[PDB]
């Protein structure tokens, strides 16, 4: 069974930095591209980052290129998201999702992890 | 950046009802070689989104046959023949026809 689990959410400091983790199981992690999607409190969804099998970022929103980093440790079967200079627009629910080629988008999502920017 | 307008944002239903939710693309999805890469995700409250229908009409794993998708170009639809309780959540259309992958505003299927 395809399972994704995000961790590391909570209260983060304004202007600070964080590392979100996503642990995958039930599929060959390394043969798949991965992404991070966030859901703001408005219920609006945005693709934060995409990474290929090989651990190379294939996409970042223009608005985020600079304070966002997506990496993977295939060996750990973990996907990471690192954001710096957090602002209040960073307050959202973060999900890791798998990019299925046939669908040509996300087929499986994790449960989510909540990041609450504070001052 | 392509805008996916979903109408109605709120659709109060009675169970056993036939629903149709709309998703309009700001740009044609048949403008490239990635012809109608329009998908639908359900997000029941507390749970993570689930792929419902991908590529306009292709039902994904775990999806009942009462769900169907249609449309092409900019006007896409999603029907639920008989609406059950388990169908109630938030519906997001999405597109991967054009970079960057974009999500809709959502249609909230709620009981009345
Ligand atoms: C997000 C995106 C649309 C979706 C695109 C997608 C979707 C599924 C996918 O599946 C992967 O396809 C690979 C392949 O085609 O060989 C397979 O190896 C993998 O196992 C599989 O996970 C790969 C890709 C590659 C680029 C992605 C784009 C980058 C952005 O610019 C754009 O907005």
Short mmCIF file of C-alpha atoms and ligand atoms in Angstrom, two decimals:
data_model
loop_
_atom_site.label_atom_id
_atom_site.label_comp_id
_atom_site.label_asym_id
_atom_site.label_seq_id
_atom_site.Cartn_x
_atom_site.Cartn_y
_atom_site.Cartn_z
CA UNK A 1 0.00 0.00 0.00
CA UNK A 2 1.19 3.50 -1.02
CA UNK A 3 1.78 5.58 2.08
CA UNK A 4 3.30 9.05 2.46
CA UNK A 5 3.79 10.67 5.86
CA UNK A 6 4.68 14.30 6.46
CA UNK A 7 6.22 15.59 9.68
CA UNK A 8 7.91 18.62 11.14
CA UNK A 9 4.95 21.08 11.23
CA UNK A 10 4.01 23.35 14.14
CA UNK A 11 4.82 26.89 15.09
CA UNK A 12 7.63 28.46 13.14
CA UNK A 13 9.02 31.98 13.79
CA UNK A 14 8.48 34.81 11.33
CA UNK A 15 11.59 35.24 9.21
CA UNK A 16 12.81 31.78 10.38
CA UNK A 17 13.38 28.43 8.66
CA UNK A 18 11.98 24.92 8.67
CA UNK A 19 12.51 21.43 7.35
CA UNK A 20 9.47 19.34 6.41
CA UNK A 21 9.97 15.60 6.04
CA UNK A 22 7.92 13.15 4.02
CA UNK A 23 8.51 9.41 4.48
CA UNK A 24 7.30 7.13 1.71
CA UNK A 25 6.53 3.42 1.74
CA UNK A 26 4.74 0.81 -0.35
CA UNK A 27 6.40 1.74 -3.64
CA UNK A 28 9.85 2.18 -5.19
CA UNK A 29 10.58 5.68 -3.89
CA UNK A 30 13.56 6.25 -6.22
CA UNK A 31 11.68 5.68 -9.52
CA UNK A 32 9.23 8.44 -8.77
CA UNK A 33 9.15 12.18 -8.95
CA UNK A 34 7.79 13.88 -5.83
CA UNK A 35 6.22 17.21 -4.93
CA UNK A 36 5.06 19.39 -2.05
CA UNK A 37 1.66 21.02 -2.19
CA UNK A 38 0.32 23.50 0.34
CA UNK A 39 -3.18 24.31 1.33
CA UNK A 40 -3.70 27.77 2.78
CA UNK A 41 -6.51 28.37 5.34
CA UNK A 42 -8.61 29.67 2.46
CA UNK A 43 -8.52 26.09 1.14
CA UNK A 44 -6.54 27.26 -1.92
CA UNK A 45 -3.82 24.83 -3.18
CA UNK A 46 -0.40 25.65 -4.64
CA UNK A 47 2.44 23.47 -5.96
CA UNK A 48 5.50 24.50 -3.87
CA UNK A 49 8.13 22.19 -5.45
CA UNK A 50 8.76 19.15 -7.71
CA UNK A 51 11.92 16.87 -7.67
CA UNK A 52 12.87 14.00 -10.02
CA UNK A 53 13.87 10.36 -9.14
CA UNK A 54 17.46 11.48 -9.14
CA UNK A 55 16.89 14.18 -6.43
CA UNK A 56 16.96 17.20 -8.71
CA UNK A 57 14.47 20.02 -8.42
CA UNK A 58 12.46 20.24 -11.63
CA UNK A 59 10.23 23.16 -10.46
CA UNK A 60 9.77 26.06 -7.97
CA UNK A 61 7.15 28.87 -8.15
CA UNK A 62 8.70 32.18 -9.26
CA UNK A 63 7.49 33.71 -5.97
CA UNK A 64 9.40 31.09 -3.95
CA UNK A 65 12.59 30.49 -6.02
CA UNK A 66 15.09 31.59 -3.39
CA UNK A 67 13.59 30.54 -0.01
CA UNK A 68 12.44 27.03 -0.96
CA UNK A 69 14.55 23.87 -1.26
CA UNK A 70 13.30 20.37 -2.09
CA UNK A 71 15.60 17.40 -1.65
CA UNK A 72 15.30 13.61 -1.12
CA UNK A 73 17.41 11.01 0.69
CA UNK A 74 16.45 7.91 -1.37
CA UNK A 75 18.27 5.73 1.13
CA UNK A 76 16.06 7.08 3.93
CA UNK A 77 13.14 7.05 1.46
CA UNK A 78 12.50 10.61 2.65
CA UNK A 79 11.61 13.79 0.83
CA UNK A 80 12.35 17.15 2.37
CA UNK A 81 11.19 20.69 2.02
CA UNK A 82 13.22 23.58 3.40
CA UNK A 83 11.87 27.11 3.55
CA UNK A 84 13.78 30.12 4.85
CA UNK A 85 12.64 33.69 5.55
CA UNK A 86 9.21 32.40 6.51
CA UNK A 87 6.46 35.00 6.22
CA UNK A 88 2.76 34.74 7.10
CA UNK A 89 1.88 33.54 3.56
CA UNK A 90 3.75 30.33 4.60
CA UNK A 91 0.89 29.54 7.05
CA UNK A 92 -0.64 26.44 5.44
CA UNK A 93 -0.97 22.66 5.53
CA UNK A 94 1.84 20.95 3.66
CA UNK A 95 1.49 17.68 1.79
CA UNK A 96 3.91 15.52 -0.11
CA UNK A 97 2.28 13.92 -3.15
CA UNK A 98 3.60 11.53 -5.76
CA UNK A 99 3.71 12.47 -9.41
CA UNK A 100 2.18 9.67 -11.43
CA UNK A 101 3.22 9.89 -15.08
CA UNK A 102 -0.03 8.48 -16.57
CA UNK A 103 -2.04 11.01 -14.57
CA UNK A 104 0.68 13.51 -15.20
CA UNK A 105 0.14 14.95 -11.78
CA UNK A 106 -0.44 13.84 -8.19
CA UNK A 107 -1.94 10.46 -7.53
CA UNK A 108 -1.10 9.90 -3.85
CA UNK A 109 -0.91 12.51 -1.09
CA UNK A 110 0.27 12.25 2.55
CA UNK A 111 -1.99 13.27 5.51
CA UNK A 112 -0.39 16.70 5.85
CA UNK A 113 1.59 18.79 8.31
CA UNK A 114 0.49 22.18 9.57
CA UNK A 115 2.95 25.11 9.61
CA UNK A 116 1.83 28.12 11.65
CA UNK A 117 4.06 31.18 11.14
CA UNK A 118 4.31 33.36 14.20
CA UNK A 119 5.88 36.55 15.49
CA UNK B 1 -0.71 31.13 -14.96
CA UNK B 2 -3.92 29.31 -15.80
CA UNK B 3 -6.96 29.99 -13.69
CA UNK B 4 -9.41 27.20 -13.01
CA UNK B 5 -12.74 28.69 -11.98
CA UNK B 6 -15.07 26.13 -10.42
CA UNK B 7 -18.85 26.80 -10.23
CA UNK B 8 -20.70 26.65 -7.96
CA UNK B 9 -18.33 27.24 -5.03
CA UNK B 10 -21.20 25.91 -2.89
CA UNK B 11 -23.62 23.17 -3.80
CA UNK B 12 -25.95 22.11 -1.00
CA UNK B 13 -27.39 18.68 -1.79
CA UNK B 14 -29.82 16.08 -0.60
CA UNK B 15 -28.58 12.47 -0.82
CA UNK B 16 -29.42 10.40 -3.88
CA UNK B 17 -29.17 13.56 -6.00
CA UNK B 18 -27.53 13.90 -9.39
CA UNK B 19 -24.77 16.52 -9.29
CA UNK B 20 -22.72 18.28 -11.88
CA UNK B 21 -19.89 20.60 -10.81
CA UNK B 22 -18.13 22.87 -13.31
CA UNK B 23 -14.50 23.77 -13.89
CA UNK B 24 -13.52 26.44 -16.39
CA UNK B 25 -10.01 26.96 -17.64
CA UNK B 26 -8.87 30.51 -18.42
CA UNK B 27 -6.87 29.12 -21.35
CA UNK B 28 -7.59 26.22 -23.67
CA UNK B 29 -6.13 22.91 -22.48
CA UNK B 30 -5.95 21.73 -26.08
CA UNK B 31 -3.66 24.67 -26.94
CA UNK B 32 -0.64 22.32 -26.72
CA UNK B 33 0.10 18.64 -27.03
CA UNK B 34 -1.06 18.12 -23.44
CA UNK B 35 -4.70 17.97 -24.44
CA UNK B 36 -7.03 18.21 -21.47
CA UNK B 37 -4.92 17.22 -18.57
CA UNK B 38 -7.81 18.06 -16.29
CA UNK B 39 -8.16 16.23 -13.00
CA UNK B 40 -10.44 16.26 -9.94
CA UNK B 41 -9.58 15.75 -6.32
CA UNK B 42 -11.92 15.24 -3.39
CA UNK B 43 -10.89 16.38 0.08
CA UNK B 44 -13.17 15.07 2.80
CA UNK B 45 -12.72 17.05 6.01
CA UNK B 46 -9.69 15.92 8.01
CA UNK B 47 -8.39 13.73 5.23
CA UNK B 48 -5.90 14.40 2.50
CA UNK B 49 -7.05 15.03 -1.08
CA UNK B 50 -7.74 11.96 -3.19
CA UNK B 51 -7.48 11.61 -6.99
CA UNK B 52 -11.05 11.12 -8.23
CA UNK B 53 -10.87 11.58 -12.02
CA UNK B 54 -7.73 12.23 -14.07
CA UNK B 55 -7.50 13.36 -17.66
CA UNK B 56 -11.13 14.58 -17.83
CA UNK B 57 -12.93 11.25 -17.44
CA UNK B 58 -10.58 8.49 -16.17
CA UNK B 59 -11.74 7.29 -12.77
CA UNK B 60 -8.90 6.40 -10.44
CA UNK B 61 -8.56 3.53 -7.96
CA UNK B 62 -11.21 3.57 -5.21
CA UNK B 63 -13.64 5.65 -7.28
CA UNK B 64 -17.18 4.34 -7.75
CA UNK B 65 -18.84 4.13 -11.17
CA UNK B 66 -21.38 6.87 -10.17
CA UNK B 67 -18.66 9.47 -10.75
CA UNK B 68 -18.00 10.58 -14.32
CA UNK B 69 -16.01 13.34 -16.07
CA UNK B 70 -16.53 15.27 -19.29
CA UNK B 71 -15.51 18.33 -21.26
CA UNK B 72 -12.71 19.50 -23.54
CA UNK B 73 -10.79 22.75 -24.10
CA UNK B 74 -12.02 25.09 -21.34
CA UNK B 75 -15.36 23.66 -20.09
CA UNK B 76 -15.13 20.48 -18.03
CA UNK B 77 -17.71 18.71 -15.88
CA UNK B 78 -17.95 16.15 -13.09
CA UNK B 79 -21.11 14.20 -12.43
CA UNK B 80 -22.10 12.06 -9.50
CA UNK B 81 -25.20 10.04 -10.52
CA UNK B 82 -26.54 9.36 -7.04
CA UNK B 83 -24.95 11.43 -4.34
CA UNK B 84 -24.01 9.68 -1.17
CA UNK B 85 -22.69 10.93 2.11
CA UNK B 86 -19.17 9.73 1.35
CA UNK B 87 -19.05 12.04 -1.71
CA UNK B 88 -19.40 15.08 0.51
CA UNK B 89 -16.20 17.05 0.69
CA UNK B 90 -14.32 19.66 -1.29
CA UNK B 91 -13.71 19.19 -5.02
CA UNK B 92 -10.70 20.66 -6.74
CA UNK B 93 -10.16 20.51 -10.50
CA UNK B 94 -6.51 20.84 -11.55
CA UNK B 95 -4.58 21.10 -14.81
CA UNK B 96 -1.10 19.86 -15.83
CA UNK B 97 -1.69 20.78 -19.50
CA UNK B 98 0.39 23.95 -18.96
CA UNK B 99 3.26 24.77 -16.63
CA UNK B 100 2.71 25.40 -13.76
CA UNK B 101 0.28 22.80 -12.55
CA UNK B 102 -2.69 24.73 -11.25
CA UNK B 103 -5.57 24.01 -8.88
CA UNK B 104 -9.16 25.26 -8.75
CA UNK B 105 -11.01 27.23 -6.11
CA UNK B 106 -13.18 24.29 -5.10
CA UNK B 107 -16.80 23.26 -4.92
CA UNK B 108 -18.05 22.32 -1.48
CA UNK B 109 -20.62 19.53 -1.62
CA UNK B 110 -22.57 19.91 1.62
CA UNK B 111 -25.72 18.35 2.99
CA UNK B 112 -28.79 20.68 3.33
C1 LIG C 1 4.50 19.64 -12.17
C2 LIG C 1 4.61 19.67 -13.70
C3 LIG C 1 3.42 18.95 -14.33
C4 LIG C 1 3.50 17.43 -14.02
C5 LIG C 1 4.79 16.83 -14.67
C6 LIG C 1 4.99 15.35 -14.35
C7 LIG C 1 3.97 14.51 -13.88
C8 LIG C 1 4.18 13.18 -13.57
C9 LIG C 1 5.44 12.66 -13.73
O1 LIG C 1 5.61 11.33 -13.40
C10 LIG C 1 6.99 10.87 -13.39
O2 LIG C 1 7.23 10.52 -14.79
C11 LIG C 1 8.56 9.95 -15.02
C12 LIG C 1 8.78 9.83 -16.52
O3 LIG C 1 8.00 10.53 -17.48
O4 LIG C 1 9.79 9.02 -17.06
C13 LIG C 1 8.62 8.56 -14.32
O5 LIG C 1 9.94 8.05 -14.35
C14 LIG C 1 8.27 8.72 -12.81
O6 LIG C 1 8.29 7.47 -12.20
C15 LIG C 1 6.99 9.55 -12.57
O7 LIG C 1 6.87 9.83 -11.17
C16 LIG C 1 6.50 13.42 -14.19
C17 LIG C 1 6.27 14.78 -14.50
C18 LIG C 1 7.44 15.59 -14.99
C19 LIG C 1 7.30 17.07 -14.89
C20 LIG C 1 6.06 17.54 -14.08
C21 LIG C 1 5.91 19.03 -14.27
C22 LIG C 1 7.04 19.92 -13.68
C23 LIG C 1 6.40 21.32 -13.72
O8 LIG C 1 7.11 22.17 -14.66
C24 LIG C 1 4.93 21.13 -14.11
O9 LIG C 1 4.06 22.12 -13.57
#
